[PDB]
């Protein structure tokens, strides 16, 4: 289907006097593969997946250079935006950056990204045409003015259409046996009494990959939308994910409810009920 490579940059200023901090993380689909932390001792881009570990010293040398360059720019970036917003040089702030490529079934660039945030709000973002910017306010337009003069719009399109894409394919081939394998979810159902007229039915989905999944409770062939409590999909800690869906139902009539589990690791959607 569709694959993706993503990077997540976080730039934090932090008075009183601590030097600003820069953290970077890289993902292929739902799998992290690299890490950097200006606070860590290493001072290099470290592998967080087996299939990148098998990479030359020259690779990690460049990756490290970039991280250090990002780390040196961080203070100035934070200092710049602090100026656009007339903010005091006494408070803490954050600049986040997300970029990467989506690889379509055709093997060409499906979609590209380069968007930044200031203190959790959209700041500036590359449009889908990869040729123009969208600034959130007159402050971000200060940045836009800069990136336009340097022709940053292109030269990120070039990266997204080339490197992002060739290396994504590379990672995908080397980690093929896992990255392109779908682990189907292990499922079961639990039951807890709420009161005398009601009870809770919980549908479990464990150890699945990728994270994309769909849990729904049904009665009379109908979805119990606003009665179903879907918890955010969470990491198991071993690389896979977990999720459940609960619905409050009248006691006794438990059997009129069936849970429907959908995952790309299953041939037919999974169907189960409570088994006392």
């Amino acid at each position: 289907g569709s694959h993706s490579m993503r990077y997540f940059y976080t730039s934090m200023s932090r008075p009183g006097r601590w030097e600003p901090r820069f953290i970077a993380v890289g993902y292929v689909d739902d799998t992290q593969f690299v890490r950097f932390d200006s606070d860590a001792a290493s001072q290099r881009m470290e592998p967080r997946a087996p299939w990148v570990e098998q990479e030359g010293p020259e690779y990690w040398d460049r990756e490290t250079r970039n991280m250090k360059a990002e780390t040196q720019n961080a203070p100035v970036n934070l200092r710049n935006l602090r100026g656009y917003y007339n903010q005091s040089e006494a408070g803490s702030h954050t600049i986040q950056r997300m970029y990467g490529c989506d690889l379509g079934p055709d093997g060409r660039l499906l979609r590209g990204y380069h968007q930044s945030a200031y203190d959790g709000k959209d700041y500036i973002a590359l449009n889908e045409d990869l040729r123009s910017w969208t600034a959130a306010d007159m402050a971000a337009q200060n940045t836009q003015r800069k990136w336009e003069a340097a022709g940053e719009a292109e030269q990120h399109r070039t990266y997204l259409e080339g490197e992002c894409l060739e290396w994504l394919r590379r990672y995908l081939e080397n980690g093929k046996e896992t990255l392109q394998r779908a682990d189907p979810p292990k499922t079961h159902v639990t039951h807890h009494p709420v009161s005398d007229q009601e009870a809770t039915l919980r549908c479990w989905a464990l150890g699945f990959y990728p994270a994309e999944i769909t849990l729904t409770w049904q009665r009379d062939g109908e979805d119990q939308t606003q009665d179903t409590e879907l918890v955010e999909t969470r990491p198991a800690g071993d690389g896979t994910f977990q999720k459940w869906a609960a619905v409050v139902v009248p006691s006794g009539k438990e059997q009129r409810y069936t849970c429907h589990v959908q995952h790309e690791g299953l041939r037919e959607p999974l169907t189960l009920r409570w088994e006392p």
């Binding site: 990077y7 890289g26 881009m45 690779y59 460049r62 990756e63 970039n66 991280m67 360059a69 990002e70 720019n73 100035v76 970036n77 710049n80 935006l81 600049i95 970029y99 930044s116 940045t143 800069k146 990136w147 340097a150 940053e152 990120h156 990266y159 490197e163 992002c164 290396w167």
Partner: peptide
Amino acid sequence: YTSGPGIRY
């Protein structure tokens, strides 16, 4: 892999 440091904000 990674993208160059680019231009400052």
